[PDB]
Design an enzyme around this catalytic site. Sequence first.
Site, PDB file in Angstrom:
ATOM      1  N   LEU E  42       6.884  -2.157  12.465  1.00 45.39           N
ATOM      2  CA  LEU E  42       6.481  -0.800  12.133  1.00 45.39           C
ATOM      3  C   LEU E  42       4.966  -0.728  11.954  1.00 45.39           C
ATOM      4  CD1 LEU E  42       9.395   0.143  12.065  1.00 45.39           C
ATOM      5  CD2 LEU E  42       9.084   0.778   9.682  1.00 45.39           C
ATOM      6  N   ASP E  43       4.458   0.496  11.837  1.00 42.98           N
ATOM      7  CA  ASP E  43       3.027   0.749  11.798  1.00 42.98           C
ATOM      8  C   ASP E  43       2.556   0.963  10.359  1.00 42.98           C
ATOM      9  OD1 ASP E  43       0.379   1.394  12.894  1.00 42.98           O
ATOM     10  OD2 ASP E  43       1.476   1.869  14.736  1.00 42.98           O
ATOM     11  N   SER E  44       1.285   1.344  10.220  1.00 39.59           N
ATOM     12  CA  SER E  44       0.674   1.506   8.906  1.00 39.59           C
ATOM     13  C   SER E  44       1.118   2.788   8.214  1.00 39.59           C
ATOM     14  CB  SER E  44      -0.851   1.475   9.035  1.00 39.59           C
ATOM     15  OG  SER E  44      -1.248   0.516  10.001  1.00 39.59           O
ATOM     16  N   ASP E  46       4.216   4.050   8.480  1.00 40.94           N
ATOM     17  CA  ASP E  46       5.647   4.040   8.220  1.00 40.94           C
ATOM     18  C   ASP E  46       5.980   3.360   6.904  1.00 40.94           C
ATOM     19  OD1 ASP E  46       5.329   4.850  10.906  1.00 40.94           O
ATOM     20  OD2 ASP E  46       5.748   2.806  11.596  1.00 40.94           O
TER      21      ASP E  46
END
Lengths: 114, 125, 304, 122, 88, 13, 70, 167, 155, 94, 64, 178, 459
Positions: E42-44, E46
Amino acid sequence: AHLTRRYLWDASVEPDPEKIPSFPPDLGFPERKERVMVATQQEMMDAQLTLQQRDYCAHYLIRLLKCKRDSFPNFLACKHEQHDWDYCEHLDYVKRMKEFERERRLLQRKKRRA
Amino acid sequence: KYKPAPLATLPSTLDPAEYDVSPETRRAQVERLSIRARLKREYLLQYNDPKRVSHIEDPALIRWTYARSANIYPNFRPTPKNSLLGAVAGFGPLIFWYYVFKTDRDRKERLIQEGKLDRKFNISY
Amino acid sequence: SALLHSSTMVVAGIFLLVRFHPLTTNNNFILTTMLCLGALTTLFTAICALTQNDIKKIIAFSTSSQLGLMMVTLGMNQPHLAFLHICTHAFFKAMLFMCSGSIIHSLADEQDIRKMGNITKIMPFTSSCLVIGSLALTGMPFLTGFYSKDLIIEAINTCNTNAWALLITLIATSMTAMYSMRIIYFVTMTKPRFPPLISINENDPDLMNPIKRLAFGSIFAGFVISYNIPPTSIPVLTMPWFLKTTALIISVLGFLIALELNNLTMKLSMNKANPYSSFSTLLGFFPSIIHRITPMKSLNLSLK
Amino acid sequence: MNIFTTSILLIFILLLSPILISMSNLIKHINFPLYTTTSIKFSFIISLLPLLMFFHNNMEYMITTWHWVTMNSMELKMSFKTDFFSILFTSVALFVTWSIMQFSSWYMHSDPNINRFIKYLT
Amino acid sequence: SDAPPLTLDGIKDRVLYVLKLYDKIDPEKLSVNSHFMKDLGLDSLDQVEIIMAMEDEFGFEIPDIDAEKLMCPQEIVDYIADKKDVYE
Amino acid sequence: GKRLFVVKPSLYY
Amino acid sequence: KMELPDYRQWKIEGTPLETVQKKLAARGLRDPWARNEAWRYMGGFAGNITFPSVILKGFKWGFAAFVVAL
Amino acid sequence: SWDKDVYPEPPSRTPAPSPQTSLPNPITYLTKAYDLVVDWPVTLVREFIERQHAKNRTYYYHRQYRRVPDITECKEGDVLCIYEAEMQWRRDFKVDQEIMNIIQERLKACQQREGENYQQNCAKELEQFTKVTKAYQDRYLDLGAYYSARKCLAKQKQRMLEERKAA
Amino acid sequence: MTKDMLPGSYPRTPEERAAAAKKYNMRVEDYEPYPDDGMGYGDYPMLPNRSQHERDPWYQWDHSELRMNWGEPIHWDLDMYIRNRVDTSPTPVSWDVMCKHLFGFVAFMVFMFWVGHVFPSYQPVGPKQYPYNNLYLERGGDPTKEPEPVVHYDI
Amino acid sequence: GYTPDEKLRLQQLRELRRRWLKDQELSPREPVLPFKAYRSSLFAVSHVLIPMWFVHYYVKYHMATKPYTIVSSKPRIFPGDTILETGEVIPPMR
Amino acid sequence: HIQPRYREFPQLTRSQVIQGEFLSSLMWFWILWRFWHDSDAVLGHFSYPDPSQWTDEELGIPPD
Amino acid sequence: AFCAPPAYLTHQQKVLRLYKRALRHLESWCIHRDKYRYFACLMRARFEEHKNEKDMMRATQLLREAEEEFWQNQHPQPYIFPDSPGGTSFERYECYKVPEWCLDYWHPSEKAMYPDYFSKREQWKKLRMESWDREVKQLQEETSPDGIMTEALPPARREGDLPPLWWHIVTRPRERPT
Amino acid sequence: MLKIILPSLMLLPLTWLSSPKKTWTNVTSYSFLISLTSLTLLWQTDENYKNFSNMFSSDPLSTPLIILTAWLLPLMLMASQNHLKKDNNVLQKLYISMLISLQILLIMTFSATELIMFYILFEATLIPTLIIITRWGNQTERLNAGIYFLFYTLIGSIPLLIALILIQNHVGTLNLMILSFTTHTLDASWSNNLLWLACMMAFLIKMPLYGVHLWLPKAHVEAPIAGSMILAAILLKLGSYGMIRISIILDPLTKYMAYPFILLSLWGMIMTSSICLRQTDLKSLIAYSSVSHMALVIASIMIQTPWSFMGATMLMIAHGLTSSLLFCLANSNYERIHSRTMIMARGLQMVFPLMATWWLMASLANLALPPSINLMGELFITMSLFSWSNFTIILMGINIIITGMYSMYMIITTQRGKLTNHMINLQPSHTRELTLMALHMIPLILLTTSPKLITGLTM
């Protein structure tokens, strides 16, 4: 309205309420009967009405308070005397509105004569 | 924008000095974290020592109490600005409320001695 | 805040001059001063709750606007009618505070209205008592609030008040209908917004019975006080019919205006942070400006 | 005249009663929220009597119970003028405090200092 | 209050119940001991959006200095348990 | 629902 | 323990979140919490209420005004 | 106890009830029940107390004070005559203050028994009150904290010199 | 404590300025004292005038109501800037437009109430008529003196 | 992310916090101590009736025997009534 | 006690729902009962007397 | 709260702090959840410019522009929680929060009122006095001699020992007591 | 009077001839019996003032002061006990001997037929208070505080001696009722103006108002609890009894010499209430509170209304009991934390429930509660100063605003709050301290119940 008219219309033909009645009552009328008070001073003083309430129509206020005292605790059954006292206060208000409109028509007579 | 005030200050997230920072300013922030870490480790060691039964003697609170109590007159220097503003703030409203009290009481004594002011029901003066 | 700061403490400032009826009457300047200042209080605490957010703060501005309207009638010199507004106001305003506290203890101290909703299907007793309390605040006919507030609006229309006081008090009672519509729309209405663990406990008769007692008082008390009390002022009922039902006219007009205003936030659009909503939401800036510039000057003069 | 006086000082005595209980050691033994809402319920039941007789006969009373202390010409007689304002507001305030004590007995159930809370409210 | 106290298995089931309702989470891939950066990818945004999910789920505020550090469901369960102070 | 120990100062003094 | 509901019962359709998600997909994005926040619009909570149904609640039983007081 | 020469109350002139409604008023029923439950043991307790007071009954006397020569007859320098006149003036000052309290109690009782229409039957009590406040403002106004017979004599000589100058 | 760790004098030299910085447990380059105006401040370090509402709330503090640390230099106005007293927290809207909005509302409402005092908004009605020479027997007057005869007629 | 040096401290401290709260659970034997409206009728006797006895004894025999302290407002006298005290009738209204 | 449910309706009791429904039903019963028994909220008196159509002879004629 | 703030907030930390303040001041503004989810994915249509910015001067300039936009369009009353600071119940339950040194000052009648808990607290105090002499020695050898010292305390490196500085964390009172 | 003076003089072999284990219990029990036998002065069935001998007289204004001296002696000897639990026996008995001797000469100063006996026992207080302050004070500045107290009071009291001997050689005997009754008016002369300033300057220093108020907070933060209670609760108001008793000589000159002292009083009470808003030391905050509450009665005896004298005497005994209770609470907090900063010790209600109630009652009598004697005295002083001038009520209104703010500031600072948890040594409240503040407050409640005793000289 009257309040609508006297702001940004002429105040000479339109009365101010603090100088009412400005005219003497002898002009316009040949005679005027006085409002004869049905409730007298001794009955009003013994009934102990407040000086705001001691108007020209306390004759039905005394009957209202007598029927409320003699019809306690059925306070729902004392609405007929409240209707009669509010009708007499409505007649005092129609006498006050009658002297208001008679004052404004007498100022119309003053500006027509001038 | 949002104008600053002395009573409604600029927040540090909206502050322009937080966005153009230098490595000497970052070294100052690292040294501020280091001195806060040293003081926090000393306070936490004195907090969790079970041999301690007394309170925490706070040296900066003792310093602030001593500075607000018994340092002001040893650190007085008489300047003309301090002397004039202290003379105004210690003398001025005494002459002002002197003029107010003497004017009102001269008015009251004059109206009593002339009879214009009436004490109608004034029993307990 | 329900017994103290809704019902009994705050009406003592009215009660001092309702006790002091025979000294207020012969002075005419202080009547106009108290009339203007209660009217300004009614506008400010009816425009504060136009976009206010904590539920006890909204009903606090409701009782402050009703307190200003009692000062309007006290400076209009019907202090018996002001006391009639006290003895009719206390029941529905403590009911609205107790209903807000029932929602607070059922939703675990969630005070913002933007995370509570659908109360008329979750808690029906609390919502029914909230709509009789808010409807008696609004002034639907022959409730406890009508038997004061209709005669209040008749005395406002018939005595020698200021024209700006007329306009500002009719606008503030339209805003009273708007903040009552804010409580009904953002608490009882719309699709829900509470945290998902729903623990609902109003089946205690210790909670059920005093809200029933204040609801029976709010359904049966304004008629019984305004019928049992003898005629203690002059009520005049002869007014024009565009000026007689004008309290109900501006109450339904404020309900429809706040309905057409609050139904726009269900629609998908952009919200504007205008200074009118900043004035309404941020409490008119009086605590910010006064409660910082008076302690800074006071304690700075105290130190320096 | 006699009943009209002692009803209003019975209201004051029944309001003084939960403070008088809370000084003693009975406060760890009785159900003090239920005791206080029963006391304010019986105080409202007592307070409906001067409401009903003032609705009947419309008599305004000035009750100076304790002559406290006299200074020069000023006396400071402790006094209880009960009228259209005081009788109606004592009845409405006692009814709404009966509602507040019955609400607070449920709402302050998590707080263990409900005796001090209800003593402060009384 | 009238709210029930929160068990560890109930807190774990609630955290997994919100976490399987995210759109970019495979529920068969999702276990309690999986890292948001390198095990579910996942990303920053999320991670802090999982933090907002716990914000409007449990009705309390997680500070951002803890919320940057929280990266997996097991210590978000243990952090929520240690903030609400439950005995198991 | 087992009762948790409420922590409280010494009310005996 | 608490019997949690299953996640398969919260779909997107039948909700205003479905309208939000299809307008947002006409824009060209997707909503990640649209299945999560569908409990406020799906289930027993589905169906908005009206101002007759909150203020005129109980009016059909409150229309029992009796003319029999003779 | 109660004496009508110093406290004149007019007697009660309450009307007959005569209830027109068929529903009986609850106040008279509840006050007959209140009398039969409460007032009869209270008056039996008071009858027992008055029986014990009449058994162990004693008398106490009002203190009477002989009038000394006042400060107009006493001599300055003669300290003992000045002290006797000063305490005579202090006793008369205390009884003047309680006489003002008597007229204040009369004014409050007349205003409460007259109610909202207080002026017509409180005119005589307000005339008596304005006469006694004019007398007290002529007697002991602005005397100071240390009021004395000498200072009241100085105020009275100042007013009599003012009236002699005016006449 | 001793006289060295207690405050005293003003830092005239940079070595005693560094000594006062290590007295107050602050940085040497951040040590800006109060100016030497003879006001009795002396070597006390001038912190920026931000209240304790503006510090970090979620960080655990040594003095929890003060939001301060142990050995951190307490502000000279900390009793002024405590959480019970005046906040210097950043407002959502700025101070000058805030003051213009509040004083414009106050001045516009005072001028509008003066406008409502100028036009007193009367109902079309006369004065309330009172009988018996306008209640001069009941207002409070001498009954032996004859009242001034005012007569309210019918229309 | 989370460093394992902080993670070991937080795991051991959370195990110690769970141990401390399970120790702060109370034992079942641990706190050791040494009809319909009948209480309403008992309150109506013991806190309504006997203070009415005391305050009524006060009002009738220490208060009303001292003067100008229970002063009634004058009750309202209407045209048509008869006051029992002196037997006179009021003349009727016009 | 309640068995507080997750993400669904609570099992609402008949005492609470008929208590609130009969309270709002009694409130609208009171509104319709008093609105039928006296409609003076909208009526008041018969009409206000407008001064425009007052006849000058019962008003009092101004002379000339 | 349980972790520690750094010396400086990084660019990623300030950007995620702006994302947190944006996604709570939104739902302070957009009250209904349909408007919250549509405007939150509009906020994702606003984050997509900040993804691959490579200069970091232009990223800090975009951070200043977004922060000025946040302070211009922020709510005057933001969304607050019952457990958050500035909230409904921020430190409301401080009537419970009386710490564990105050149980030493109890009377022996109240100590005999709770038999087993005070014996277990005696066991916890024995664990304190047998753990502290190795806890305070651990910090003086895991303290770095260099000029940088962090705020986060070290764990229990020795097996069988407690972590250093454990008592003030482990004996806080509960946030929701009753 | 000698049944109050001479067994108090016989308390000295009770101190010095008993066992050191039993000095505190014998001296406290027999000093409570001294207060019980000093309740005998309330037998005024007439306005003739009680003159037991040619040495000593009883006055209606001086009798609540004389019961406050004989009641303040066991309240000091309670509070010195854990203060002196570590000192040895001969210093403990010397402290008890100096306290008892201060009580003896304060009783003898309040019973004064003659004003030069009043001056002898008025300046006889300056030795044992200095013995208490500058030996048993716990900080460095007690030498400077003793020099400040001693020399402020002696540079006031030397022209009091000058004007008393000049008045005596002018007119004859300095007996108070002799010089009340045989005296004459004073001419408007500048030597009589300097006589006014000379005979008033001692009491104008002893009651703190501006120019000369500064010895009180130094000799309250450097005092012990018995020295602080005596200097806050009766020995400060010994000069107020003198300021009452001097003014009957010289009443015609006070109506134009009054104005700078009322001016300095009113602006000093606004500025000292403003001082107490920002104060670190709690004992200094109660000290400047005593400065403001003394500037009120400086204005009240600089006016000569009888209403002012009743509000004055009510403020005397209300301020003495309230400031003694507040200083005892400050000594209790100093006993717990070994400091007097209000900031460093907050949240104390969480560990002390009933000491919060006594803190609430003391500071909520400092903030003037309406049935209490504090608002009774302040309201009568407000009545008299509004009779003096109609524009003065805004100044005392600003004072009552800031006295509410400093009293509830001290409550919200040191009682409510987060409970600072770095103190293990907050031991629970002693039975001594709880009954000490109970025997402070229950006389104020009974004095609220019966205010006929406290009406002063002039009605």
